[PDB]
C-alpha cells in the first residue's frame, strides 16, 4: 500500500440525470462506511444503514455512529461509479480537499470535526429511484463543537432527570436536538459520571482549602474576576463551605498527592470530549488559497 485507499461505490443504472447532477453538486462532501471494503455499495452510505432498532436515529445515536464507522471524501462522481478516499487508516493522502457544510467560517489551521445535522434542515439528497436518503455529516471546528456537545449532553441529562442557542463569532445558531427515546441518554450519562468520579483524589483536600486564596486573588487581580463568576460552585463554597486542618497523609515522606491528583486529570480530560463526542480527523491548511472559508467553499486539508 503506497496510494490512498480508494473506494469504488457503484450507482445502479436506474438513476435520474437530475440525481446525477445533484451528485455533481456534492463532490467534496464526506460520507462514512460500516466496514472498509474496496467495492462498496450505494446502500451502505444511505440512511437505511443508520437504523437502530428499525427507525431513523437521534442526535446521540448518530454521534456514536460517526465514530463507530470509517470516513471518506467524495473526490469526483462519474456515470460509471463513485470515488472516495479513506481518511484515517492508510497514511498517504495528498492534496485532499473538503467542502465546508456549516453555518460558520473556517479559519486557517483549525481542526475539523463532524457532527450530525442539527442546525436547521439538513442538505439531504433524496434518491427516489432507489428510495435512499443521503445526509452528509457536518464540518465543525474543534473549539466550537465542544460547546454543542456540552449543551446537548446537558439537555440529555435534564430530560432523563426532569440554552438551545449558541453564540460563536457574534452569531446565534439555535440547537434543535432531539432524543425520541431514553437509552442513548443514560448510555452517555454513565460515561459522564464515570469520568467525573476518577478526577477527585487525595490532594483535592489541599486544592479545596485553596478556594479562599482564589477568592482573595479574585479581589486582587482582574481576569480572575472573569473566571470566578461563571463557576456556579466555587462562588458558593468558599463563602458557605469550610474544610478543617487536613490530617497528615499516610507515609507523607515518600509519596506526593498533588502530582497524582493533577496527572490523573490531564489524561481523563483529553479523552473526555472524544468520548461524549468525536475526535478531530482533519485540519484546514490552505497553502495559497483564500484566507478564511465561507459556508460552502472547497477547502484544502491534511488529515490529523
Amino acid at each position: 500500500m503506497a496510494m490512498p485507499f480508494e473506494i469504488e461505490v457503484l450507482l445502479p443504472g436506474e438513476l435520474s440525470p437530475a440525481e446525477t447532477s445533484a451528485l455533481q453538486k456534492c463532490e467534496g462532501k464526506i460520507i462514512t462506511f460500516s466496514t472498509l471494503r474496496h467495492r462498496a455499495s450505494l446502500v451502505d452510505i444511505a440512511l437505511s444503514s443508520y437504523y437502530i432498532n428499525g427507525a431513523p436515529p437521534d442526535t446521540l445515536s448518530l454521534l456514536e455512529a460517526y465514530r463507530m464507522r470509517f470516513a471518506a471524501v467524495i473526490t469526483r462522481v462519474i456515470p460509471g461509479k463513485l470515488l472516495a478516499h479513506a481518511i484515517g487508516v492508510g497514511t498517504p493522502t495528498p492534496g485532499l480537499f473538503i467542502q465546508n457544510t456549516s453555518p460558520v467560517d473556517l479559519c486557517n489551521g483549525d481542526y475539523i470535526c463532524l457532527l450530525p445535522p442539527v442546525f436547521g434542515s439538513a442538505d439531504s439528497i433524496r434518491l427516489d429511484s432507489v428510495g435512499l436518503e443521503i445526509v452528509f455529516p457536518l464540518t465543525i471546528p474543534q473549539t466550537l463543537m465542544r460547546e454543542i456537545i456540552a449543551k446537548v449532553v446537558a439537555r440529555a441529562v435534564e430530560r432523563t432527570a426532569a440554552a438551545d442557542v449558541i453564540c460563536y463569532n457574534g452569531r446565534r445558531y439555535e440547537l434543535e436536538t432531539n432524543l425520541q427515546h431514553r437509552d442513548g441518554s443514560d448510555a452517555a450519562i454513565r460515561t459522564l459520571v464515570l469520568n467525573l468520579m476518577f478526577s477527585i483524589n487525595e490532594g483535592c483536600l489541599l486544592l479545596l482549602a485553596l478556594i479562599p486564596t482564589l477568592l482573595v486573588q479574585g479581589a486582587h487581580d482582574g481576569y480572575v474576576n472573569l473566571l470566578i463568576q461563571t463557576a456556579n460552585c466555587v462562588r458558593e463554597t468558599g463563602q458557605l463551605i469550610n474544610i478543617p486542618p487536613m490530617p497528615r497523609i499516610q507515609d507523607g515522606h515518600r509519596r506526593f498527592p498533588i502530582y497524582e491528583t493533577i496527572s490523573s486529570w490531564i489524561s481523563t480530560s483529553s479523552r473526555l470530549g472524544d468520548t461524549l463526542g468525536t475526535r478531530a480527523i482533519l485540519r484546514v491548511c490552505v497553502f495559497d488559497g483564500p484566507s478564511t472559508v465561507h459556508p460552502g467553499d472547497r477547502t484544502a486539508v491534511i488529515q490529523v
Binding site: 466496514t35 471494503r37 476518577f198 474544610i243 499516610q250 515518600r254 509519596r255
Partner: protein, 316 residues
C-alpha cells in the same frame, strides 16, 4: 517504500539467530528510571523496596551485572515478544501452545540459567505492577525483525518500522522477502469474541492485561486484531473482561477522600495501535514450526502495514 531502523544491544534477552524474521521485537527503557518513579508513585502503606529487590535480584544474575547503572553506554535494549510471552506462560488460556513455547525457548537459548532469568523477569513484572509502575509505560514496539549480525555477546538488529511488510528485501535462505509471524499463544482477536466477523480492514493492537490483587499480581499481553477503531476498542475489551475490572476496582465537614478507587488502582488493560491490514479479508495460518530442535505453533499473518504514533490508551 518502507523504513528501517537499527540498534546494537546485548543478546541477553534476545538472540536473532533463534528468532525468525518477521517476529516482533520490543524495546525497553532504562531500569534506573523505575527507582524514582516508584519512589513517587507507590501507594501509601506500601514499600517499593520490593520492586528494588525484584530489579536488583533480576540484574544480579542475567549478564555482566556491572555497567547496568548510570554510566551505561551499552545495555540490554531489545527483547523478543516470544520471550516476554513465555516468561508468563502461566496465564494464557490456550495452555498447551504456551507451554510448548516456554519449553522451546528455555531449551533454545543459552541453556544455562535461563530458568533463572525467566522467573527473574516474571517476578520483576509482578513487582512493578504491584508498586503501580506499569510495564506498558516502559516497553514499546520496535519493529519486525529483518536482518541481524551477531558477535560474542552482542548483536546488531535492523528491523522494519514503517510501511508494508513484504516490501523489504533481505538476504535470506529461501526468498528475498519475509512475512510477519507471532507465537500462537498471544494471538487473541477481538472480532470473533464480539461476533461481528466481517471482512475488510483490521487494525493490530498490542494490549496488556493487569490483575492487581494483593500478593496475587498478574501481567500478560496479547496481540489483538480487530475491526474496531482505536476509540471503541477500549470499550470492546473492557466489556469481555468484566470480572477483572470488577475485582480490580473493588480490591485495588472533613472530606476524607481516603481509600477511594484511584486510576492506578482501577486499571486493568492498556493497548496501542501498531499497524493495519488493508486487504480484502485477512487470512492467517496456524502452522506448527520449528525453533531449532523444538516445534511450536505460530500465526502467519499476511500484508501488515506497520503503523506508528506510539501512544498508549488506558482502560480503568
Amino acid at each position: 517504500t518502507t523504513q528501517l531502523i537499527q540498534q546494537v544491544s546485548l543478546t541477553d534477552f534476545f538472540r536473532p539467530d533463534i528468532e525468525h524474521a518477521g517476529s516482533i521485537v520490543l524495546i525497553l527503557r532504562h531500569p534506573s528510571d523505575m527507582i524514582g518513579e516508584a519512589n513517587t508513585l507507590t501507594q501509601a502503606g506500601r514499600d517499593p523496596d520490593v520492586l528494588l529487590e525484584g530489579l536488583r535480584n533480576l540484574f544480579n544474575a542475567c549478564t555482566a551485572p556491572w555497567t547496568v547503572g548510570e554510566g551505561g553506554g551499552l545495555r540490554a535494549y531489545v527483547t523478543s515478544l516470544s520471550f516476554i510471552a513465555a516468561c508468563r506462560a502461566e496465564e494464557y488460556t490456550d495452555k498447551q501452545a504456551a507451554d510448548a513455547n516456554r519449553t522451546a525457548i528455555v531449551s533454545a537459548y543459552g541453556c544455562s540459567r535461563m530458568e533463572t532469568r525467566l522467573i527473574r523477569f516474571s517476578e520483576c513484572l509482578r513487582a512493578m505492577v504491584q508498586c503501580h509502575v506499569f510495564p506498558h509505560r516502559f516497553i514499546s514496539f520496535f519493529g519486525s525483525l529483518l536482518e541481524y549480525t551477531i558477535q560474542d555477546n552482542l548483536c546488531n538488529i535492523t528491523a522494519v518500522a514503517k510501511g508494508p511488510q513484504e516490501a523489504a528485501r533481505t538476504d535470506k535462505t529461501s526468498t528475498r522477502r519475509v512475512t510477519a509471524n507471532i507465537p500462537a499463544c498471544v494471538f487473541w482477536d477481538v472480532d470473533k469474541d464480539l461476533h461481528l466477523s466481517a471482512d475488510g480492514l483490521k487494525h493490530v493492537f498490542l494490549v496488556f492485561v493487569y490483575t492487581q490483587r494483593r500478593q496475587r499480581e498478574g501481567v500478560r499481553l496479547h496481540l489483538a486484531l480487530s475491526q474496531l477503531n482505536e476509540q471503541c476498542f477500549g470499550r470492546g475489551i473492557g466489556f469481555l473482561l468484566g470480572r477483572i475490572r470488577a475485582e480490580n476496582a473493588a480490591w485495588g465537614w472533613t472530606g476524607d477522600f481516603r481509600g477511594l478507587p484511584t486510576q492506578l488502582s482501577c486499571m486493568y488493560a492498556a493497548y496501542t495501535l501498531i499497524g493495519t491490514i488493508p486487504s480484502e479479508s485477512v487470512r492467517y495460518t496456524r502452522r506448527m514450526e520449528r525453533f531449532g530442535g523444538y516445534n511450536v505453533p505460530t500465526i502467519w499473518l499476511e500484508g501488515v502495514v506497520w503503523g506508528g504514533t506510539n501512544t498508549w490508551n488506558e482502560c480503568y
